Symmetry: D3
Subunit: 338 residues, 6 copies
């Protein structure tokens, strides 16, 4: 998959495309409808399926540091796009271009001159051009006799509107199960494992993995979750009895760091039935279900007691998740008991 | 108007004065009664009308960093004093003098030796001398046969006590309309315009002006307000179609800056029907009425939609404010519609 | 009293001991039962009474910066231990030793090889060994025919379980009277006096003493308390009319410092009927009873008025405290009136 | 003078213009040669004289936070342009436009489509287009039969190249006299006066005005300088015996905060023979000549002794500056004697 | 390769081993002599080749935050050990164990009880036990009829001692060529690529990759270097015309943030003749030779001019590195011409 | 000794006094000449010997945060005054009083009305009144037939002027021996011992005591010094084989935190031939002579080697200090041999 930053980076010899346009944060089930529609048409006419997306978030251009939290990183947005059949992603920066353009010139410059599009696919909530003047209906009329337009209804399922907003709401509530249902996959984050408390191994109270994330990253509410930890493909040696590319059952503790930065987030993972230290590796953490709210501990005895209960409930939640094989990992480790 | 810092700075040849004493923060309608009384008497006897005020705030001397928020800056207190006819302001620093003085010596040193006062005007809540021992009644008896004393009742109107405390309460609640009613004018702040999001001009979502204020400055609660923006007199060039010394209709967004300083306040002004960038100018922002609480935005479409509604409600509120010509600006710009 | 950091520091020629083991934070009335039991047995057999305690807090080893607040400093834990008849304290660091040891090896290495113990005393909630596997019952069976074991019930009195947890709860609520009841003494902190507002002396609104404490120190909730201030023994000169080693009646204001560190705690003490400045001295502050919640002040008049009411209520609370001579200070200063 | 941010802000109404292009930082005597030629030609014909300038600095777009120090602020660059008869300034942001553009498209888009230029004036060092490809020669040949081009050699005078670089070098060395010679005026900074050491008045060692500047502001090397302080036009009252719009002789101390939130240069002004406090006013500080390097003081007698020597040297230096009228203030206060 | 944190993590199953002990920072050519001897002997017999190493650095246990800079990370030390045929690494924390131990108990506990060693290989400078008491000679005599001991002299080559100290000196001076000679490979760092100046692509002065390193990481002196950049194995899409696992010729700028939260060195890589943006990828940067010291730029034409000179020098230097095959990349991209 | 903050704290009861005036920072041998003369005269008559001193430093009132480093704290200045027989110290704050006062009003207000002085003793360099107008000669003539005045020349000894400046120079250079010669005692600092590297005990490279000082404290140049450490009188238990009120031979390492919240010098003390941990105690550290400059260590064997050399040099230096009794400790611990 090609990745182009700005209209100038797009190849001049691009001959034909089917294009979908949006922020696409989270690549949720509604987004997948737009992408599938685009990929299907591109196949039919022998063109490239192209995603036009935005970075920074369009809201951040107007309200710096008050944009919505990133459901995924830009890098994972690219990976997800590719996984659903996108051939090229054009990343637009509204501080550089296409902000003060009329709807008419937006279609002329982006869809025609740049992308040579014969088809465009957008959601019913699509807007474009200076001061948001263009709507999905504007697009239909401007494109008359120039390219075909598919405006897809926003996705409603089980009485819920599936949008980036609703996914962020679910994550903020700690309802990862609903977030996952809307995403069509387990919500996950990926990052390097750093040093934390002790070293991972025989001690149940030392995390197997410690990770930290910036304040722009959407994470579930502080608390403990059932999930799966995967060491991403690597030839680097691994301390302990975990193999790369296997999803290991884990109790995952999400927290925040007080006094200096009221939003520096940590993810501490306690891998079930394993003795390992993952310092230095890139690790994916998929969230499955909420186990409990955060609590303060008065003794090691109490801490370890609650730890063991988290493991018990995690084991039950994950055993059930496997049966929803569709979101479950292909290769996984989960013992029937300790 | 003369401004003296400390008793030592007062001219030795001062021959006669009528004096009022207090913090005078906000120069509200109650304060204006005291000042008017003082100016009237000074006129009658051919003396100077003098305000004795305090900086730092007397409370801050005892409780550093826990003094009440400044309704106005000291500089604006001076400007307001002058506007109501005060001929001289004596600024007293309680860390330097008059803190450990008996009520008797306070009158002897300040009113007589320093100010050569023939008349003094204070509120019913006036206190002075070491450990607040002197009251308004103490002042009356100490001044017997030495100078005349006018003790003015605290102002009650529409079931509300007008005090600096009540004004701060109204501002904290976002009730700028009540604050204004108590002040006898539009509550305002003034400051240099700095760079913010984008550049002011054609884009509706970029503020016309961005300003920042320190944590000691009383501002209305976070939210959006209807108000008037005035570029203070200047010969410096102005970017766009705003002229200096005209009050322009504006939607004003007051906010705070998270993580590092839970009280760094911003004021972002969106001037109605104008395309301008006010970087580098000193701008006055007068608040008229509350429009809405702060909210987070999920898209540019939503942001601009709410922006347009703020403009609509601001236009209605300001059209009404003009009819209260008494607080309304003398020279103003407000279009009937977009 | 000997203080040993780590098993290696214990003398090899130690011949016999009676040992009690625990965090002992606060040395509350339940802790005193264990210590008294240990000291009594050591006397009976002519052995040393030894306390095995832990620093850092065992919880902090697993959850750095999320351990419970220190009811006392380690230094005061030592002083309290000594006051109840302990002959030696062994301080164990779980990052160095005894964390990954089996219950069996824990008894062999610590109690036998290191301490040559003939008797051990623990609470019913005692746990030890890797992953908290050892309990009080484990200890009884492991020690069969090797040393005698006394497991003491946790202390319940007036429907309250006396534990470090319950004491911290009372302090957090500002219920110093209940905290004191559980501790068997006045809760106190000690530290050097630094510069604050003004200088202590004739001015009622300037504290006699200003102290600051780190975020790991348990202090009562923000507010005003009745208490006793003692200048610890010193030959350094004292500014004003306070003598060392006398408990002076005081109104004590506990506060926190906003914006940078949402937990930097201050203790400002206003000593009744005294004019003094305690800069540079080490001062003990004992808390007796809650007087009022924190409030913001709008004027010096109001501040001093509330100050005087605090003094009045403090005088009444302390006059009553003296009658509970058992917790009251041996040498004290408290005037019948101002 | 009009100020336009970006090409889209420029009136489509624009019929004809004489244009000059450059960073123009400092608007030094070399820059004035370019501006003079443009204004003359514009006056010759019926054309607007337009300056195209750049913000942020083009170097900072490549190397963020490694751009040269600003000899003046952008606001002062506008002020200076207007003073030399420029009718409009177009401010280009290279992160928005004219960056990836080739030399050929640059001339078409900027000079023809946007500015409708009949004449261009650029320096011999002028560069444009992608990867700095376009040059002075490339401009004469691109504009063939479209715009008359005037390329002006870089100014050499007294064996010294007058450039922004050269001016920054002089300032960095503390050689303000040479900087002024190159600039064609006294180097100056402007800004609000804040609270500092004590209050301005009768005491000599307390500044008349205290100002602080961010670290992007070019200032002379730390030290003491002879200069002029002017209170900018205002109707606000002035504490002391100074009036607005008069240049007062001052000894100016430039310093740096050893380590206070990084950044932050200080300018402290001691106005000769005046007793005033300029808190809250905007003041202009013009630098005439270096007096001495920074030094540390061990006593008050020593500090004041050197202070007195600073005033004596300043009187002499400022007398010569008035004698060398060309650069001196048109309306000034300078006593020959103390 | 196995990685064990502490002696208790080592399998009790371990029957036989050839062991080498040291900090092994950098795993330079002297270290490789020790490792080679251990691996050969292990291969000779039926034994595991084990490295005992130390984290944190033994100096930091005595002098926190005053330890030498890490030539490599601990993760890379593991990677290097594995590449030289080490079968297990035992990581010792001297704050946990083997610190107070005498030389005699060290050999019994570490080499016999834990590792069951038949052979030991140590440097002539090797020290162990309490207060650095044990030495190379003490090891040969302690292991009598237990373990065969091979003491290897410190490596001297070309009149230079090859040590971690010597390597750090070379790096600090910017002499990466000498560092590489001592290391037996190109010195490198690895890390995720982040957002930096603009986006990587057609523009030459914007880096292909931006990386930041903490202040514990040894890096070459600030300046420009010729090197190779490799995208580490990944299935993630790449923006631009670069492929993973190929070493691309690059000009590498090493810098320091003047004062940004302390710490933080930057490595900015400009890949020759490629237009790419490596945001989100893990990349390895190998340093071959010094090109120039840091310099400040006053114009874009000047910056790009020097940039072009940097590329020319880099081409020449990297051509020679490929000619000196031994150290060059096995699969690389380098154009002879621009 | 009495301590009075400000003239208003001085008893109105005061009938007669011999007074000396000065900053008295360090209370060096020149200061002792002034104090001795005052105490003798007070003893001669029936008068109190009074020191008038200044806090904050008079330089800091003019130049905040640019005052000289404190040779001692104000608390230690009180301690030293008392030790030389001063009966009262009056502390003057020049931001409160005696600043704007003329020389004539200074003598009337301070020496007559407040202190009722029959005798004054000042240095030849003495200055007072507004703008440093009053001098030594002006004092003899102002006090005519009121107070007998004794002006004492500044102390020159061994060709060196003994002044606070001279003492600070010696300290800054690391020449503590010369500083001690000028002071008439060992230069010292006092403060609480905190947690540092490991715990004090059997290990040689871990300090017996760790202390930190703010940046206003004069300390010797970074490096290693021979000195004496004394635990100040206490009934608190001591960990290890040290007793209070005995001066123990120590090697003292003075350092600076490279960049940790700014400020913060460290003093780490290694007590010879003792195994102790002084956490929580107040300790006095006396400096006798410089041993070596700071150096970085690359190994533990190297660190301990230099540590051992430091102890050897310290033994020799402290043996000579005991031989030069005059300055040595009256009760000390120093072994001739390790």
């Amino acid at each position: 998959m090609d990745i182009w930053y700005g209209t100038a980076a797009v190849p001049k010899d691009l001959d034909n495309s089917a294009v979908t346009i949006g922020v696409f944060d989270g690549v949720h089930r509604g987004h997948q409808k737009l992408i599938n529609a685009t990929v299907e048409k591109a196949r039919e006419v022998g063109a490239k399926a192209i995603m036009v997306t935005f970075d920074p978030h369009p809201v951040s251009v107007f309200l710096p540091r008050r944009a919505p939290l990133g459901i995924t990183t830009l890098a994972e947005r690219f990976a997800l796009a590719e996984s659903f059949g996108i051939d090229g992603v054009l990343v637009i920066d509204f501080t550089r271009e296409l902000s003060g353009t009329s709807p008419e010139k937006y279609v002329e410059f982006l869809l025609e001159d740049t992308l040579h599009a014969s088809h465009v696919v957008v959601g019913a909530n699509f807007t474009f051009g200076e001061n948001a003047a263009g709507t999905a209906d504007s697009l239909r009329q401007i494109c008359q006799s120039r390219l075909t337009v598919d405006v897809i209804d926003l996705l409603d399922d089980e009485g819920v509107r599936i949008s980036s907003t609703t996914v962020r709401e679910f994550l903020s509530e700690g309802d990862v199960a609903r977030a996952n249902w809307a995403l069509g996959r387990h919500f996950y984050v990926t990052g390097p494992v750093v040093r934390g408390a002790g070293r991972g191994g025989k001690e149940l109270g030392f995390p197997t993995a410690n990770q930290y994330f910036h304040d722009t990253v959407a994470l579930p509410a502080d608390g403990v979750y059932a999930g799966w930890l995967t060491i991403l493909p690597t030839e680097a040696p691994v301390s302990g009895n975990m193999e790369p590319e296997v999803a290991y059952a884990a109790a995952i503790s999400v927290g925040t760091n007080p006094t200096f930065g009221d939003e520096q987030r940590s993810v501490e993972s306690f891998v079930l039935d394993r003795d390992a230290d993952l310092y230095g590796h890139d690790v994916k953490v998929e969230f499955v279900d909420h186990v409990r709210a955060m609590e303060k501990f008065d003794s090691v005895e109490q801490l370890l007691e609650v730890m063991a209960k988290d493991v018990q409930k995690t084991r039950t939640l994950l055993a059930q998740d496997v049966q929803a094989h569709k979101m479950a990992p292909e290769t996984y480790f989960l013992q029937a008991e300790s």
